[PDB]
């Protein structure tokens, strides 16, 4: 029948949310550039713990948002904040590896520590200002009203602001550094640095591959795609969310 498969897959996704949480927590535990690792794992723990469960019940299964509408804003803010933070943590790690390969000379432990701490602080600052953006800049509301459903504000200005801030800018950074990183990963100017390059390159590839369907179909909707089935919208969303699970699997594989 119909909903039997649906229950089975919902149970699987709940298991996936829990495995995401646990694996990132394990990587966090073994730590305490390990501060960038810690920052990324923190953002992915927050995704799996705050973002994913609520999306799993509401957007993916179908139960309607009878929860307090004053917390709909908090769930949206957590989603935006944590996914932006995870994307930019991957790109900060990418910048660190590109500066290890190309800028080998001036990147001493002092300089590297300084730059990685600045990047972590900046990552979380930009995630905040992107998430809680229409509040200080105060040009609208963060949820889409007129809906008995909890959906992000699809107002054009915030949409451009958040997607360029969360996906397209970090995508441009990673597409700038990916050439040298891939070359290093293939030994094209010793085994440890090659292993490092390969891990980072795989992380970038899975990030791009995991988040590109959602953001790409989020840009083509406002251009005549007035009917993209929300089933595939949710599939693309959760494919983005699975990046939070693939990053641990990739890190613990090296």
């Amino acid at each position: 029948l119909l909903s039997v498969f649906g229950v089975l897959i919902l149970t699987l996704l709940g298991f996936l949310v829990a495995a995401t949480f646990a694996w990132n927590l394990l990587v966090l535990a073994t730590i305490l550039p390990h501060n960038l690792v810690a920052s990324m794992a923190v953002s992915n723990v927050l995704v799996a713990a705050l973002v994913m469960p609520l999306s799993l019940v509401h957007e993916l299964s179908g139960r309607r948002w009878q929860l307090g509408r004053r917390l709909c804003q908090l769930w949206i803010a957590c989603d935006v904040l944590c996914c932006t933070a995870s994307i930019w943590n991957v790109t900060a790690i990418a910048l660190d590896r590109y500066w290890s390969i190309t800028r080998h000379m001036e990147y001493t432990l002092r300089t590297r520590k300084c730059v990685s701490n600045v990047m972590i602080a900046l990552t979380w600052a930009l995630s905040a200002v992107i998430s809680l953006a229409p509040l200080l800049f105060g040009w609208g509301e963060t949820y889409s009203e007129g809906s008995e459903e909890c959906q992000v504000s699809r107002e054009p200005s915030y949409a451009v602001f958040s997607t360029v801030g969360a996906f397209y800018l970090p995508l441009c950074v990673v597409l700038f550094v990916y050439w040298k990183i891939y070359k290093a990963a293939k030994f094209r100017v010793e085994q440890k640095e090659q292993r490092a390059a390969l891990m980072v390159g795989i992380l970038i590839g899975v990030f791009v591959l995991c988040w590109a369907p959602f953001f790409l179909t989020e840009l083509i909707s406002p251009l005549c795609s007035c009917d993209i089935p929300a089933i595939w919208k949710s599939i693309f969303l959760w494919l983005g969310y699975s990046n939070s699970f693939f990053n641990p699997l990739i890190y613990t594989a090296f």
Partner: protein
Amino acid sequence: SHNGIDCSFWNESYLTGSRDERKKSLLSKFGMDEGVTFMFIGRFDRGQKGVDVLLKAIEILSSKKEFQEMRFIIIGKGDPELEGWARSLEEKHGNVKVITEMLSREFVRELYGSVDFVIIPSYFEPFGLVALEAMCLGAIPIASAVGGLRDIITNETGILVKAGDPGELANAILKALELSRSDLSKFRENCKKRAMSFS
């Protein structure tokens, strides 16, 4: 390249037998027998690689009882006076061997893999390639605290001394001779991990 070390060449697995057996076999071919072995490998020159400091340290050490227990292998060529001074010390003592020909990488690997102590008395070293090659095969480093040598060597990885000072080097060789206990094995493996950390 980026001056990394090839972990697939500088590895002990290429070598046959036990480390003590290799050290005994190597000493035998120089008319010497079991002692605590020190090694220098580099160009002979004033002011850069520090063979002068090492020669002076050896002259200092020559007067003490512990000198009977040491063995020294100097490997290189260069400034003729340094070569003659080295030959002079080789002739005065049977625990000192000097090699002035260029040696193959495989042979030098076999050396690093039995010699148990490499002295790197450099005035300035950019990369410390010799220190990594030695460490990857268990040789414990005794280097001057300059350049990338201090980056590579930590509290529990070797001995550091002030560059250019012969007495400090001779004292370091004395401390390392004092250091000769089974603990050497621990001290070796630290090196081998740290060297892999610079692959």
